[PDB]
Design a protein around this ligand. Structure first.
Ligand SMILES: Cc1cc2nc3c(=O)[nH]c(=O)nc-3n(C[C@H](O)[C@H](O)[C@H](O)COP(=O)(O)OP(=O)(O)OC[C@H]3O[C@@H](n4cnc5c(N)ncnc54)[C@H](O)[C@@H]3O)c2cc1C
Ligand SMILES: Cc1cc2nc3c(=O)[nH]c(=O)nc-3n(C[C@H](O)[C@H](O)[C@H](O)COP(=O)(O)OP(=O)(O)OC[C@H]3O[C@@H](n4cnc5c(N)ncnc54)[C@H](O)[C@@H]3O)c2cc1C
Ligand SMILES: CC(=O)NCC[C@H]1C(=O)Nc2ccc(NC(C)=O)cc21
Ligand SMILES: CC(=O)NCC[C@H]1C(=O)Nc2ccc(NC(C)=O)cc21
Ligand SMILES: [Zn+2]
Ligand SMILES: [Zn+2]
Lengths: 230, 230
C-alpha cells in the first residue's frame, strides 16, 4: 500500500503453473492492500503484430510505412490504437510491473513480445534522451517471473543452455532497463513439469513469501558485468 | 549450386531497408541458380500466438491445455494448423534459412517470434532427446540478417548496448543451434536510418557481395565463449 502493481501474464491455461503464480501474486499483493491489475494477454487475444493498424486516423507518411516514426508521432498526437493506450495507462499507473510467462526459445512467448513491441513506444517508454537510467519509466520497478522446461543445472555457465543470466539480457537490460525501469531480481521457477508436487508447492511459496517483502528489495545492477561477468 | 534457400522475412514496408536486403538476397541467390522461397510474414498476416487453435484433433488432455505437449502430439498425428505445416515444409526442403528482420528490443519482432514459437515444434525441429548437435534440423544452415537503430559503436563491449553478440545468444544458440542448425556469421547492418545514402548502398552491396560466396562459408562455433568472450 498504496502501491500499484500490473501483472502482464502470458499463458493460455488458468490451471497451469504460470496461472498459479499469477494467482498467488494477485492474492498476496491484494492482501497487503496493493492495487493490482492483470493484463491476461491470451484471454484478451492481444494483438502481437506491429502494423499500421496501431495508428488511427491518417498516417504521417501514407507512402512508406515506418513503424517507429509513425508510433512516436501517434503517441504525441494521441492517435494510437486503444488496445495500446489501454496498456500504456495501466503501465503509467503501475509502481511495479511483473511479467509472468513460460520461457519460449530463451525469451518471452510472441504474444508478450508483441506487448513489449507495441506498448513500449517511443515517447511513452523511452526517448532521445531518456533511455537506460533516464528512460521515461524511471521510478518504476519491473520483475520477470519466468518458468522453464530446462532444469537449473542445464542453466549454468558450463551447462548446455548457459547461465540463466545470458538469456535475461535482452529482456532485463535491452528492454526494461532501456525504458528506465529498475529491475528486480528475476524470479525463475525451474522445470515445474518434471518437479514433484512438493517441489512445485515449494516454488509457489518461495514466490508467495518473496512477494511479502517485495517493496523492501534492492534492484539488481542491470549491467553487462551482472549478466555475463565474474 | 543446386541449393534451396528459405528467407523468413519480417518487415511491414517493401520500400524499407530490410525489404532492399531481402530483394538483393532473392536476386543474388536466384542469379546463382538457387531455389528461393520467401515467407513474408506481415504480408501473410502470419499468426504469432501459440493457442489451442494450432491443433485440430482431440487433445491428449483437454482439461489442462499444455501447448508444448499438444503440439508435439499434433505434429506426430499431422493435426497441426496448416499455416504451421506450410512453414515446416519450407524449412524441411531448405538447405539454408535466412532470417531478415529489424532488431526489436534486442530480439526479433513478435511476428517472427511467433513463427519460431509455432513452427519449430517438438517432433519437427527437436525432440527430448534430440537437440543442440542432435537437433532434428541438423545438416541445415541458418543466418540472421539484422538491421539496427543503434550504431556499431553503441553495440560494443564498452558501448551502452553491450556487444552485438550478446543479443544474438537466444536466437543463435537458444533457438537455431538448439534445433540442430549450424549458424553462419550474422549479417548486421547497423543504423541505416542515420547512415548516409552512400553508406546505405555500401551495406546493401556488402550483403549482395557476401551472398556470392555463402556456400563456401563455414559456420561459427555457436558457444558461450563465441558470444560472451571471458
Ligand atoms: C514454444 C515453446 C518454446 C519453449 N522454449 C523453451 C526454452 O527456450 N527453454 C526452456 O527451458 N523451456 C522452453 N519451453 C518449455 C516451457 O518453458 C515450459 O514448458 C513451461 O515453462 C512450463 O510452465 P507451465 O506453466 O506451462 O507448466 P504446467 O505444465 O502448467 O505446470 C507443471 C505442473 O504443475 C502443476 N501445477 C499447477 N499449479 C500448481 C500448484 N499451485 N502447485 C503445484 N503444482 C501446480 C500443473 O498442473 C502441471 O502438472 C518451451 C515451450 C514451448 C511451448
Ligand atoms: C518496436 C521497435 C523496437 C526496436 N528495438 C530496437 C533495439 O532493440 N535496438 C536497436 O538498435 N534498434 C531498435 N529499433 C530500431 C529498428 O531496429 C530500426 O528502426 C530498423 O532496424 C531500421 O531498419 P529499416 O528497414 O526499418 O530501415 P528504413 O527506415 O526502411 O531504412 C533506412 C533508410 O534506408 C533507405 N533505403 C531503403 N532501401 C535502400 C537501398 N536499397 N539503398 C539505400 N537506401 C535504402 C530507406 O528509404 C530509409 O530512408 C526498434 C524499432 C522498433 C519500431
Ligand atoms: C528435460 C526437458 O524436458 N527439457 C526441456 C527442454 C527445453 C529447453 O531446454 N530448450 C527448449 C526449447 C523448446 C522447448 N519446447 C517444448 C518443451 O515444447 C523446450 C526446451
Ligand atoms: C538510437 C537507437 O535506436 N539506439 C539503440 C537502442 C535500442 C533499444 O534497446 N531499444 C530500442 C527501441 C527503439 C529504438 N529505436 C526506435 C526507432 O524505436 C532503439 C532501441
Ligand atoms: Zn541494464
Ligand atoms: Zn550454440
Amino acid at each position: 500500500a498504496g502501491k500499484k502493481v500490473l501483472i502482464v501474464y502470458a499463458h493460455q491455461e488458468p490451471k497451469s503453473f504460470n496461472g498459479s503464480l499469477k494467482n498467488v501474486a494477485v492474492d498476496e499483493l491484494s492482501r497487503q492492500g496493493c492495487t493490482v491489475t492483470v493484463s491476461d494477454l491470451y484471454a484478451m487475444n492481444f494483438e502481437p503484430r506491429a502494423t499500421d493498424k496501431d495508428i488511427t486516423g491518417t498516417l504521417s507518411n501514407p507512402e512508406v510505412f515506418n513503424y517507429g516514426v509513425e508510433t512516436h508521432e501517434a503517441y504525441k498526437q494521441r492517435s494510437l490504437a486503444s488496445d495500446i493506450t489501454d496498456e500504456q495507462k495501466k503501465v503509467r499507473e503501475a509502481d511495479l510491473v511483473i511479467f509472468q510467462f513460460p520461457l519460449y526459445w530463451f525469451s518471452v512467448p510472441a504474444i508478450l513480445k508483441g506487448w513489449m513491441d507495441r506498448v513500449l513506444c517511443q515517447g511513452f517508454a523511452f526517448d532521445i534522451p531518456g533511455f537506460y537510467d533516464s528512460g521515461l519509466l524511471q521510478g518504476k520497478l519491473a520483475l520477470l517471473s519466468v518458468t522453464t522446461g530446462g532444469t537449473a543445472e542445464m542453466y549454468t555457465k558450463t551447462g548446455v543452455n548457459g547461465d540463466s543470466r545470458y538469456f535475461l539480457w535482452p529482456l532485463q537490460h535491452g528492454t526494461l532497463h532501456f525504458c528506465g525501469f529498475k529491475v528486480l531480481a528475476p524470479q525463475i521457477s525451474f522445470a515445474p513439469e518434471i518437479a514433484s508436487e512438493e517441489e512445485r508447492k515449494g516454488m509457489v511459496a518461495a514466490w508467495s513469501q518473496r512477494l511479502q517483502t517485495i517493496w523492501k528489495e534492492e534492484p539488481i545492477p542491470c549491467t553487462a558485468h551482472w549478466h555475463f561477468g565474474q
